[PDB]
Structure formats: C-alpha cells, structure tokens
C-alpha cells in the first residue's frame, strides 16, 4: 500500500494543477451520477446520506477549526 | 545603389534579436507563490477554515 | 531539474563574468548591426546584366545576403561565448539563496508568522536594487507649511 | 514626397500607423524593405498597445497614446500620476483584504499594496541600468546616424 501511494502520487504530481482539478471533478461527478441513476436501492441511498455527512464534517469544520467537528455530548 | 550603403540589418531585425524574449516581471512570484501558499495556508494551519487536520489525523472523541 | 537550474544559474553567473571581464556594452552583441561588414565589396549592379524589373530583387538579395551573413556571424560569435561560459561554469562556486517556501515540518503545521515572513521576502524583491527616491510629501510638513502660508495670508 | 513631408516622430498619427504608410510610400509591395517596414510596424504596435494598457491605469482607456509616445512622461509625472490615484487604491486594497478569504490573502494584499504603493519602487530602468539605457538610446541614434550619412553622401 505504500509503494501504491507512492506510485499514485509520483504520478500525480507530474500534472499540472488544472489536469489534477478537471480530471478529479470527472471523477467525483460520474461516480455520484451512478449513485444518482440508481434509486431505490439501499446502497445508494446510504451513499447520499454519506455523501451529505462529509459536507456536515468539512461544515462543522469550517464553523470551528481550532476545536474539531462539533460532537454532540 | 544608395540603399547597398545602408545597414543591411533591419530595424526589425535589430528589435527582434535584442527584445528576444519577453521579460519576466518582478510581481510574478509574488503572485504565484502568493497563490500557492494561499493552499499551504488553507491545509495546514490549525486556523484555517478548510484544515487538513481532522482529516488526517481525524480525532478521538 | 533542480540541477538543471543550478547549471543554468551557473552559467548565467559565467555569462555575465565573463562578459564583465571584458566590460563589454550589453546590448552590443545582441544587436546584429555590430556583426554586419560595412567594409563589404559592394557589388556594382551594371555587371551583373538586369532588365527592367530585375535591380531591386538584385538589391534585396545583396541585402538578404548580408544581413544573413551578420546574423549567422551573430551566431558564430554566442556558440562561441556559449563554449567558453560552458568550459568556466564548471569551475564554479554554486552558492544562491533558496527560494523562500513556508517551513513546514513532516507532521506539523505551518504558521501564519511564517508565511508571513515568506511573502515579507517576496515583496522585498519588488523594490528594485537602485531606485529614486521620489519624496511623496508628508502631510506633517504639508498642514505646516499651508498653514504658514495662511499666517502670511495666502 | 507625400507622407515623408512629416518628420518620423513629429506627425499626428501613432508611430506604427505613420510606419506604415511612409514604408507603403518608399517601397512597392515587393520589396524586403517594405516587408521588414510592415513588421517594424507591427512591433512599435505592440509597444503601443504595451504603453497603452499601463497608462490606462492612470489615464483611463481612451488615453491618446501619441503625447505618452512623443514625450514619455518623466520621473516627476509619474510619481505626480501615482499619488494622484493613491486614495482609490488605499480604500480598494482595504476593501480587498476586508474581503480576502483569509488573513494570510489579506496580509499578502496589504502588504503587495504597500510595497506598490510607495513611489519610490517604481523601477526605473535608466536608474537601475544606465548604460543599458545610454545603448537603447545610441540603438536609434545610431540609424539616425546612418541616414544623415546617406544624406551626407548624397
């Protein structure tokens, strides 16, 4: 697993910045539009709802930095 | 023949063999740097907004 | 690449050593009128047998001509300056500032009075290494001295 | 003579436009130095269109880029030209670094605005190399030269 990382990554920092952002939004927008297109399955629901969980962390990270994200207690 | 007198090397040519390539600007590391270090800031600052820090090392609660 | 670039910094040091020992103008070797003979044999255009139309293309070839000769000599003169840089860049010294990055350490973070530091190091680069010091007028001496004047009356 | 009644620098046309039509007057289209005329042309264009968009900075975008090419301004005018604008930049740099997404853009603004605002750091280039702009000089002084040696001759 090292050696996979280093690998992605020593091919990833040969590109360009504008390579690395167009090539990851492709990414990101064809596999949430294949949990999109499928509904009314389990799976993709639950990817949705972590989709929404990881926009609530990088939120409740945004509202307090220096704390972490904000933990119900 | 008055014109075999004259330099034969054009005013253009003069232009285009002094003025070679286009100059590289003082402001333009600052600017570059300045927009690349704007995301060394954004990662890895404990201050920042969008930190790296609780995604990497995530958090024990 | 970064010992590319230390060659090439190298060599550009050599370029301006060894064009300040011979404490030439600087834009006397890039200007190709200086490598052009102004003491060519000039050929008399009632030799070489034209018709009507036929002088001013005699007149731009031997102006083409001598211009690519001044150019080529150009040419010859820098594979020249590029060989001797090239044999001294070698011998050399190599020790230039690194370019001024934010310190960050393996797991750590980086602060803000350090990158603040870094674009302090930036902007110290924009101001040039002889300026004039044009006086902007302090407003101190500019109250003082209107004032003055309204003590006189105008 | 037609166009060539007017000096190269004293008409009213730019430089580049007036270029043209004393090349398309001295030469027919088939020349080389209607060629080589066209692209010196083309390259004092792109002086004008390099002096015209960091003058409208100060001037506005209709600037009249003959009296800026006639009489470049001096030292004095453009220090008088950078305070003239200095309270708009102090209130848009401030109003930048209120709206900067971070306080390292908002010192990185503040202070890239400081250093650009100071009169003193405009680079000059006959005060940083001046025997570079003694030979820029001598590199049209020189042709000059040239003509009045043919004139001379003639």
């Known amino acids: 697993i090292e050696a996979e990382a280093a690998s992605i990554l020593d091919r990833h920092l040969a590109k360009p910045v ?56 | 023949d008055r014109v075999l007198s ?56 | ?97 690194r370019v001024a990055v934010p310190e960050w350490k393996k797991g750590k973070t980086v602060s803000i009075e350090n990158l603040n530091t870094v674009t302090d190091k930036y902007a110290a680069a924009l101001v040039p290494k002889r300026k004039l010091a044009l006086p902007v007028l302090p407003e101190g001496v500019k109250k003082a001295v209107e004032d003055f004047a309204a003590s006189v009356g105008q | 003579l037609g166009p060539q009644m007017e000096a190269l620098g004293a008409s009213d046309l730019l430089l580049s436009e007036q270029i043209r039509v004393i090349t398309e007057h001295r030469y027919t289209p088939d020349r080389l130095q209607y060629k080589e005329g066209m692209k010196l042309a083309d390259k004092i264009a792109a002086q004008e269109a390099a002096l015209k968009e960091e003058l409208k900075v100060i001037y506005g975008d209709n600037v009249d880029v003959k009296h800026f090419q006639a009489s470049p301004r001096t030292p004095v005018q453009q220090l008088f030209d950078s305070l003239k604008n200095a309270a708009a930049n102090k209130e848009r740099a401030a109003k930048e670094a209120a709206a900067a997404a971070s306080p390292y ?15 003193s750091n405009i680079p000059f280039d006959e005060v940083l190399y001046p025997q570079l702009s003694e030979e820029l000089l001598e590199l049209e002084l020189s042709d000059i030269r040239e003509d009045e040696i043919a004139l001379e001759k003639a």
């Open chain 1, 18 to 73: 504008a390579q690395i952002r167009k090539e990851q939004a492709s990414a990101y927008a064809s596999l949430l539009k294949r949990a999109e297109t499928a509904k009314g399955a389990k799976w993709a629901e639950k990817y949705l709802e972590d989709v929404k969980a990881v926009q609530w962390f990088d939120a409740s990270v945004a509202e307090a930095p220096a704390s972490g994200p904000k933990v119900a207690a």
């Open chain 2, 6 to 61: 004259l330099p034969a090397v054009s005013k253009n040519q003069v232009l285009e063999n002094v003025f070679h390539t286009a100059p590289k600007a003082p402001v333009e590391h600052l600017e570059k740097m300045v927009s690349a270090n704007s995301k060394v800031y954004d990662a890895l600052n404990l201050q920042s907004k969008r930190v790296l820090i609780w995604q990497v090392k995530p958090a024990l609660f």
């Open chain 3, 1 to 97: 690449k970064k010992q590319a670039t230390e060659n090439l910094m190298k060599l550009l040091q050599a370029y301006k050593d060894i064009g300040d020992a011979k404490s030439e103008p600087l834009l006397k070797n890039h200007n190709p009128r200086t490598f052009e003979d102004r003491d060519y044999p000039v050929p008399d255009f009632r030799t070489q047998n034209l018709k009507a139309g036929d002088v001013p293309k005699f007149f731009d070839t031997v102006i083409s001509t001598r211009a690519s000769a001044a150019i080529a000599s150009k040419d010859k003169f820098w594979a020249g300056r590029k060989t001797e840089a090239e044999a001294a860049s070698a011998k050399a010294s190599a020790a230039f500032p």
């Open chain 4, 105 to 119: 853009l908002a010192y990185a603004v503040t202070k890239k605005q400081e250093v650009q605002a100071d009169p």
